[PDB]
Write the structure tokens for this entry.
Amino acid sequence: MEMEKEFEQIDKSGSWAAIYQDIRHEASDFPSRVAKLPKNKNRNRYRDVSPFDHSRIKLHQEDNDYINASLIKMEEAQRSYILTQGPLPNTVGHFWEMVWEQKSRGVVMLNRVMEKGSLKCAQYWPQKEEKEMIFEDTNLKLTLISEDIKSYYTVRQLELENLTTQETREILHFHYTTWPDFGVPESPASFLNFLFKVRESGSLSPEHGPVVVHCSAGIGRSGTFCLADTCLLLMDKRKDPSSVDIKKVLLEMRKFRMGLIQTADQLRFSYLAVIEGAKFIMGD
Ligand SMILES: O=C(O)c1cccc(-c2ccco2)c1
């Protein structure tokens, strides 16, 4: 069923809350035993948001390999994403270790450091060129190279140095700065513009490790970004673009990380973004 007609049918019937609960009911449940070990309590931002054991990213160290991060591998679309929480004061070094070890080119940040008067994630990147950051626990140096501030987002060029080998890499930081404190954006135009800027950078392409995507918990806004990207790519690839079923793509993604798309409004916004984005994919 053409999702644009499914959309008008759910809207006219006001059944978004009902569709959403149906997804919550059918979603996978896998063990998260490593996340719940007592040694890892200060590595988790939220007690109810944990990576599954089968899909968790492992840090390359014998001490403690744990980070709150999941590999979402989309087989038909040929795209992979790492979804993670906003870094905590004691996990900023783990965060950059993961970027280094997974060979990522891009970090996508969908939250502000402060929202609703509370801290949603650590200040994990340098704000001035001449004030670099050293992560002594993981032996990394991070330097701000350049910053481009636009109305709806900021792009930063960062240099990450492995102090052990003196290898360096360029990381691109894509920071969506205008998601509202409550609810979802009224139009998806600025979110799609942002998604197309990440794609244009090479950050989502198979010559690099998976893109790292986060918000505060790494399930809600983060879920919306990867769901929209994957659905538009499948509409490009398939003989019949009207066969793309957004609810079925979301359940596939929930096999790899719990809780993706946190509200019925985020579900409705994901539909709007895919429907408006398809008017480019189909030749405009
Ligand atoms: O990434 C870096 O370490 C670096 C160092 C010097 C110059 C530039 C640069 C990028 C685009 C034009 O010049 C980048």
Notes: The longest strand covers residues 140-149. Residues 145, 157, 159, 170 surround (3M)-3-(furan-2-yl)benzoic acid (CB under 6 Å). The two ends are 22 Å apart (CA to CA).
